[PDB]
Amino acid sequence: MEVEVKLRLLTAAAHLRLTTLLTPYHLKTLHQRNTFFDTPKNDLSLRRAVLRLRFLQNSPSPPRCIVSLKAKPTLANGISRVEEDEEEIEYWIGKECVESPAKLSDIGSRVLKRVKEEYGFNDFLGFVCLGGFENVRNVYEWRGVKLEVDETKYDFGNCYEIECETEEPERVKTMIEEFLTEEKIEFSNSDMTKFAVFRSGKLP
């Protein structure tokens, strides 16, 4: 399972201050476009599953496409746990699927096989693209952990987050909140996944 500390930064101002503070620890900046697929009846969603194609970038810096299936999420007290499985596919192939989701059927993918077998589909001809959104992710190596600071760009406005994948979520969360508190950065627990915010059509 994927386990993460997940905190929301309440304002663009908080986000700007945090990235400024973490400058020396900066590792890389990733541009991610997240796109999602399901049947029009929301078969996957109704079973709390999410099928995502992520396009990411940031010479040589070829873009990549990663398919992921996430299921059975739990998000509580700033700590997220979810079943996650991901697999790289050819970028040009993923791109075509956004425009024609039936073409998910034409991919020799282990994860897409899982979706078929576990959710009861023989193909993806009945699937639609739910759309997606862009996210900018700054990655920092800070005090023994990898912090991911996100600026998530929805059409209804931007959202900002800090995430940290860790086996010690309680210790790491404390360590992070202490730092944010001392630096007077405004935050709270993140109560929804990016996909959930996206689907709600409104900011948290």
mmCIF file of N, CA, C and O in Angstrom, residues 9 11-26 28-29 136-140 147-151 160-162 179-180 185:
data_model
loop_
_atom_site.group_PDB
_atom_site.id
_atom_site.type_symbol
_atom_site.label_atom_id
_atom_site.label_comp_id
_atom_site.label_asym_id
_atom_site.label_seq_id
_atom_site.Cartn_x
_atom_site.Cartn_y
_atom_site.Cartn_z
ATOM 1 N N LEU A 9 -1.844 23.334 1.865
ATOM 2 C CA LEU A 9 -1.363 24.697 2.113
ATOM 3 C C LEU A 9 -2.501 25.626 1.739
ATOM 4 O O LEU A 9 -3.049 25.530 0.650
ATOM 5 N N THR A 11 -3.060 28.898 1.174
ATOM 6 C CA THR A 11 -3.025 29.996 0.213
ATOM 7 C C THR A 11 -1.837 29.891 -0.736
ATOM 8 O O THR A 11 -0.847 29.221 -0.441
ATOM 9 N N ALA A 12 -1.938 30.562 -1.879
ATOM 10 C CA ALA A 12 -0.809 30.667 -2.796
ATOM 11 C C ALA A 12 0.363 31.301 -2.064
ATOM 12 O O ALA A 12 1.515 30.963 -2.301
ATOM 13 N N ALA A 13 0.058 32.220 -1.156
ATOM 14 C CA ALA A 13 1.097 32.893 -0.381
ATOM 15 C C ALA A 13 1.866 31.888 0.488
ATOM 16 O O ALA A 13 3.101 31.890 0.522
ATOM 17 N N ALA A 14 1.137 31.006 1.167
ATOM 18 C CA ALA A 14 1.768 29.936 1.951
ATOM 19 C C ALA A 14 2.666 29.056 1.079
ATOM 20 O O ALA A 14 3.796 28.744 1.457
ATOM 21 N N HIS A 15 2.158 28.660 -0.086
ATOM 22 C CA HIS A 15 2.913 27.831 -1.029
ATOM 23 C C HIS A 15 4.199 28.512 -1.486
ATOM 24 O O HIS A 15 5.261 27.887 -1.561
ATOM 25 N N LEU A 16 4.096 29.797 -1.813
ATOM 26 C CA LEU A 16 5.259 30.547 -2.278
ATOM 27 C C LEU A 16 6.292 30.628 -1.171
ATOM 28 O O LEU A 16 7.478 30.420 -1.402
ATOM 29 N N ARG A 17 5.842 30.919 0.039
ATOM 30 C CA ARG A 17 6.778 30.983 1.167
ATOM 31 C C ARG A 17 7.466 29.638 1.408
ATOM 32 O O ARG A 17 8.667 29.574 1.659
ATOM 33 N N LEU A 18 6.707 28.551 1.319
ATOM 34 C CA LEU A 18 7.283 27.241 1.590
ATOM 35 C C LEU A 18 8.333 26.883 0.534
ATOM 36 O O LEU A 18 9.413 26.418 0.879
ATOM 37 N N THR A 19 8.035 27.117 -0.746
ATOM 38 C CA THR A 19 8.988 26.749 -1.797
ATOM 39 C C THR A 19 10.251 27.600 -1.695
ATOM 40 O O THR A 19 11.354 27.142 -1.987
ATOM 41 N N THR A 20 10.076 28.850 -1.289
ATOM 42 C CA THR A 20 11.212 29.733 -1.046
ATOM 43 C C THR A 20 12.084 29.185 0.091
ATOM 44 O O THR A 20 13.300 29.020 -0.062
ATOM 45 N N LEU A 21 11.450 28.847 1.205
ATOM 46 C CA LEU A 21 12.153 28.232 2.332
ATOM 47 C C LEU A 21 12.892 26.946 1.994
ATOM 48 O O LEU A 21 13.918 26.654 2.600
ATOM 49 N N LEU A 22 12.357 26.148 1.070
ATOM 50 C CA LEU A 22 12.932 24.835 0.799
ATOM 51 C C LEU A 22 13.913 24.871 -0.367
ATOM 52 O O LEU A 22 14.389 23.837 -0.817
ATOM 53 N N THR A 23 14.202 26.067 -0.855
ATOM 54 C CA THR A 23 15.079 26.228 -2.008
ATOM 55 C C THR A 23 16.353 25.389 -1.935
ATOM 56 O O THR A 23 16.692 24.692 -2.886
ATOM 57 N N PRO A 24 17.077 25.460 -0.810
ATOM 58 C CA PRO A 24 18.343 24.720 -0.787
ATOM 59 C C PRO A 24 18.138 23.212 -0.936
ATOM 60 O O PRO A 24 19.054 22.518 -1.373
ATOM 61 N N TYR A 25 16.950 22.718 -0.597
ATOM 62 C CA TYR A 25 16.702 21.280 -0.572
ATOM 63 C C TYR A 25 16.105 20.759 -1.874
ATOM 64 O O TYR A 25 15.790 19.584 -1.977
ATOM 65 N N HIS A 26 15.952 21.639 -2.855
ATOM 66 C CA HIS A 26 15.245 21.305 -4.085
ATOM 67 C C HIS A 26 15.952 20.213 -4.887
ATOM 68 O O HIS A 26 17.159 20.274 -5.123
ATOM 69 N N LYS A 28 14.003 18.432 -7.795
ATOM 70 C CA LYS A 28 13.504 18.511 -9.177
ATOM 71 C C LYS A 28 12.100 19.062 -9.237
ATOM 72 O O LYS A 28 11.388 19.072 -8.241
ATOM 73 N N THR A 29 11.709 19.518 -10.424
ATOM 74 C CA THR A 29 10.367 20.024 -10.645
ATOM 75 C C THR A 29 9.726 19.220 -11.774
ATOM 76 O O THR A 29 10.308 19.090 -12.848
ATOM 77 N N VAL A 136 1.890 20.857 -10.772
ATOM 78 C CA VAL A 136 3.323 21.068 -10.771
ATOM 79 C C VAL A 136 3.863 20.561 -9.443
ATOM 80 O O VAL A 136 3.420 20.995 -8.381
ATOM 81 N N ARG A 137 4.827 19.651 -9.507
ATOM 82 C CA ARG A 137 5.342 19.035 -8.291
ATOM 83 C C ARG A 137 6.810 19.370 -8.055
ATOM 84 O O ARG A 137 7.667 19.003 -8.856
ATOM 85 N N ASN A 138 7.093 20.082 -6.963
ATOM 86 C CA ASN A 138 8.468 20.290 -6.547
ATOM 87 C C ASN A 138 8.863 19.236 -5.531
ATOM 88 O O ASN A 138 8.155 19.013 -4.555
ATOM 89 N N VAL A 139 10.004 18.606 -5.769
ATOM 90 C CA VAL A 139 10.484 17.534 -4.919
ATOM 91 C C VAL A 139 11.711 18.029 -4.170
ATOM 92 O O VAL A 139 12.633 18.581 -4.781
ATOM 93 N N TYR A 140 11.720 17.809 -2.857
ATOM 94 C CA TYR A 140 12.804 18.257 -1.980
ATOM 95 C C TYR A 140 13.318 17.094 -1.136
ATOM 96 O O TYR A 140 12.557 16.206 -0.757
ATOM 97 N N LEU A 147 9.930 15.337 0.303
ATOM 98 C CA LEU A 147 8.715 16.124 0.364
ATOM 99 C C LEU A 147 8.296 16.422 -1.058
ATOM 100 O O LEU A 147 9.135 16.732 -1.899
ATOM 101 N N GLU A 148 7.001 16.343 -1.321
ATOM 102 C CA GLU A 148 6.471 16.700 -2.627
ATOM 103 C C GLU A 148 5.506 17.851 -2.405
ATOM 104 O O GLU A 148 4.523 17.706 -1.689
ATOM 105 N N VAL A 149 5.820 19.011 -2.967
ATOM 106 C CA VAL A 149 4.962 20.176 -2.802
ATOM 107 C C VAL A 149 4.237 20.422 -4.128
ATOM 108 O O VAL A 149 4.876 20.631 -5.159
ATOM 109 N N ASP A 150 2.910 20.405 -4.090
ATOM 110 C CA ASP A 150 2.105 20.456 -5.310
ATOM 111 C C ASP A 150 1.369 21.776 -5.493
ATOM 112 O O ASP A 150 0.837 22.349 -4.544
ATOM 113 N N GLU A 151 1.329 22.235 -6.737
ATOM 114 C CA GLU A 151 0.415 23.289 -7.148
ATOM 115 C C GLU A 151 -0.482 22.630 -8.187
ATOM 116 O O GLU A 151 -0.011 22.266 -9.260
ATOM 117 N N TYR A 160 -3.076 23.761 -3.273
ATOM 118 C CA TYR A 160 -1.677 23.566 -2.938
ATOM 119 C C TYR A 160 -1.575 22.540 -1.823
ATOM 120 O O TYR A 160 -2.363 22.566 -0.879
ATOM 121 N N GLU A 161 -0.580 21.667 -1.923
ATOM 122 C CA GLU A 161 -0.448 20.563 -0.981
ATOM 123 C C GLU A 161 0.994 20.219 -0.709
ATOM 124 O O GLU A 161 1.891 20.579 -1.474
ATOM 125 N N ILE A 162 1.199 19.491 0.387
ATOM 126 C CA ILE A 162 2.481 18.874 0.681
ATOM 127 C C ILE A 162 2.198 17.406 0.914
ATOM 128 O O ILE A 162 1.281 17.056 1.649
ATOM 129 N N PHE A 179 7.717 22.202 11.642
ATOM 130 C CA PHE A 179 8.419 23.111 10.747
ATOM 131 C C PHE A 179 7.462 24.165 10.192
ATOM 132 O O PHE A 179 7.729 25.356 10.286
ATOM 133 N N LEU A 180 6.337 23.733 9.634
ATOM 134 C CA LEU A 180 5.375 24.678 9.067
ATOM 135 C C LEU A 180 4.907 25.664 10.137
ATOM 136 O O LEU A 180 4.751 26.854 9.883
ATOM 137 N N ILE A 185 3.611 28.919 8.332
ATOM 138 C CA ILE A 185 2.986 28.570 7.055
ATOM 139 C C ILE A 185 1.582 28.043 7.343
ATOM 140 O O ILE A 185 1.419 27.152 8.170
#
